[PDB]
Ligand binder design. Sequence first.
Ligand SMILES: [Mg+2]
Ligand code: NA
Ligand code: NA
Ligand code: NA
Ligand code: NA
Ligand code: NA
Ligand code: NA
Ligand code: NA
Length: 177
Amino acid sequence: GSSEGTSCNSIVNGCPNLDFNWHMDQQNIMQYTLDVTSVSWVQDNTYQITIHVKGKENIDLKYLWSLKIIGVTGPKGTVQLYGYNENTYLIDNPTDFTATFEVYATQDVNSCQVWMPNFQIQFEYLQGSAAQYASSWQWGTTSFDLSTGCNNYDNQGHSQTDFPGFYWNIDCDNNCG
Ligand SMILES: [Mg+2]
Ligand code: NA
Ligand code: NA
Ligand code: NA
Ligand code: NA
Ligand code: NA
Ligand code: NA
Ligand code: NA
């Protein structure tokens, strides 16, 4: 049984034993982590998800120019979180934030579970007026995208993505099976 708005009980990291750090380390990008902390079924194949993203060290908001979720398969392909040009100020810490948005999840794992469609998070530090803080920037690459997924890894257990992929129950039907 399905009811619109139902929360999924069991959000599954689909590849928790991959090394996701290697991909950031190789690019001189500070490590970040991502977890999918909530999933609920809206209707049809649309789910509302909440992510929590944390950076290894704290980076003050003053250093940030823009931050957006990109490559989303969902009602909106781009989710703006911060940006001066975009006049959007929804997060106050680019190294400890949450975001909530909708995805269309359609690629089934099995008869009960469906994959999160993968996406990226685009960070732009030290651009525009934030460039004034270059003298104290200490965290490596300033302009980068971090990607999710379990579908792209090497033969030595390193992901070529930065964050795991996830799956959950179709329609958040928590008693499927
Ligand atoms: Mg997506
Ligand atoms: Na794994
Ligand atoms: Na529906
Ligand atoms: Na729909
Ligand atoms: Na949510
Ligand atoms: Na803000
Ligand atoms: Na099955
Ligand atoms: Na970028």
